[PDB]
Design an enzyme around this catalytic site. Sequence first.
Site, short mmCIF file in Angstrom:
data_model
loop_
_atom_site.label_atom_id
_atom_site.label_comp_id
_atom_site.label_asym_id
_atom_site.label_seq_id
_atom_site.Cartn_x
_atom_site.Cartn_y
_atom_site.Cartn_z
N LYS A 83 0.92 -1.18 0.04
CA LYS A 83 0.02 0.01 0.09
C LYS A 83 0.71 1.33 -0.01
O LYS A 83 0.35 2.21 -0.33
CB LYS A 83 -0.77 0.09 1.08
N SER A 89 -1.87 -12.71 4.06
CA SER A 89 -2.33 -12.61 2.84
C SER A 89 -1.36 -13.18 1.96
O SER A 89 -1.56 -13.50 0.62
CB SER A 89 -2.99 -11.28 2.15
#
Lengths: 310, 310
Positions: free
Chosen positions: B41, B271
């Site tokens: 991100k 993840s």
Amino acid sequence: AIYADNSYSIGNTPLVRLKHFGHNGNVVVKIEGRNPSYSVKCRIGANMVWQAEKDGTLTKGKEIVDATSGNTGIALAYVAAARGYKITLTAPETMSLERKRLLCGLGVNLVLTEGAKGAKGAIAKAEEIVASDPSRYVMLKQFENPANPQIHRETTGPEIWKDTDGKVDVVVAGVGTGGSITGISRAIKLDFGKQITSVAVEPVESPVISQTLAGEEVKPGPHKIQGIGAGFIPKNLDLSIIDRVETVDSDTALATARRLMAEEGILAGISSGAAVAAADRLAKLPEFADKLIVVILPSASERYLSTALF
Amino acid sequence: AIYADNSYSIGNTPLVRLKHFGHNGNVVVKIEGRNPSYSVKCRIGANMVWQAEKDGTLTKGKEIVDATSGNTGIALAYVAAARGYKITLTAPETMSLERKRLLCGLGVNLVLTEGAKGAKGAIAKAEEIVASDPSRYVMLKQFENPANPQIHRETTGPEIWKDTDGKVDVVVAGVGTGGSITGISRAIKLDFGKQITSVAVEPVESPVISQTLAGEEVKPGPHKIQGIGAGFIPKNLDLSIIDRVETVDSDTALATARRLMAEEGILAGISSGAAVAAADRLAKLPEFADKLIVVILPSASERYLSTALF
């Protein structure tokens, strides 16, 4: 550019110019938190294992044993996992639950020693394990293994040289093993031939490099600047290439790391704040005004969430 | 190569070949944990701010407001600090103490909302704050802002292309906002012209992309794979470039992240384990045997020390 395992991905860390430290942009930091296991030690964990392989001291069938739960333990852990070695790390039973989980997650055989015996109890237990079968166990000894400063001479130093186009004038690094400032300084002064100023940083609470160079009684003491200030002169600190020693107090180191986060958006660790605090003092002396100052930031903020940093 | 602030240092993350997954080295992972605030991100936090500056929606005097305490909140926080913006982030009062400290350390104005209202209570409060003075507050909206997939088309995708010398055949990425797989796939398929297989990964517990593409009732559900499985199709997921959707369960995602740590020495997040688990299944089909499979690993292990990962 696909690395055969995570150990080969060490380094190539970025330089970022500071805006709220220094004078007219003369302080730039190298972010060693961007490494395979997120510290400067990833480089020496890699190279001490590689050199032991080349030396024939590390082979299939041998196990790494060492006494460190700090950044070097994490570094050796990921390298051992990446390259297929069992590793045993000893640490006092008092280490944080978060660090036990991290090392256990990396597959370390964690041997917890008596809390009352501290770091010495852990070193003793590691030496005992090695004694029990020296053809089986290898201790890599970060404070004296020349593969530690060597990897900084081969990677960290040339990265600074190339990324600054040879314009670096000053290197500022806290001293734990001494490997970083030693290898970086050898690279720039001896391989690239530029007579820079090499600045070691140590806690004012444990200023043993300053005391030694002044001929004074060496008097270590406790401090909060994790990763530096070991209380002795390590073999991997080449005093002959140190031009200056700056001392920094624990509170200011912490406050400076907090400023790096909130004012620069740099997720630095505690010793990163110590190094920048020392660099900021030099950068605001007129004698350093036209000098490009490069500061090693050894680690990243989230490794310190349970510390006085936060 | 000195970055003017930490936001310009995004990306250039390494590819590492896996040894205990896949078949004959056909699975390689991209380590997005090596970024300024240590996740994928960081790229979109940088570029959503840069594009808002270019658009004139973000100026001196305006404040960033958003509802996220996850990786995007951390990303926007470091970018706001690096570039001189105040930022307010809303989150339910139930968020972990460690994440409050991290965001507070980065200078965020943390507005804690009612715990019973969850993520919706936080989004509402953010929208209320923006409503109170829309000439003052900017919400960047990661699920719909095209600057999110754009930065992956300009950096992440070309990095994969260059580091594999154009040999990448398959890209495997968990879908949170969809920005990564969307931008990477547009880069490789449209800018470099190679007809790769783009694989979205989602939780089997919340398989809304699979259900949508099959024409079935969309039925989201809770899962532990932090960062993916938002329970809806985000605007920044370009379904037209998705070739395959793989579902992964939370337990196997966790177990696979633990294997990445202990067997590969890769400090991956939850993840990351989900994406590798899906890639490993494809890599062991004979139809993928001669295909180079590149897997995005969004984040790093220490951000998960208080989770089921450890």
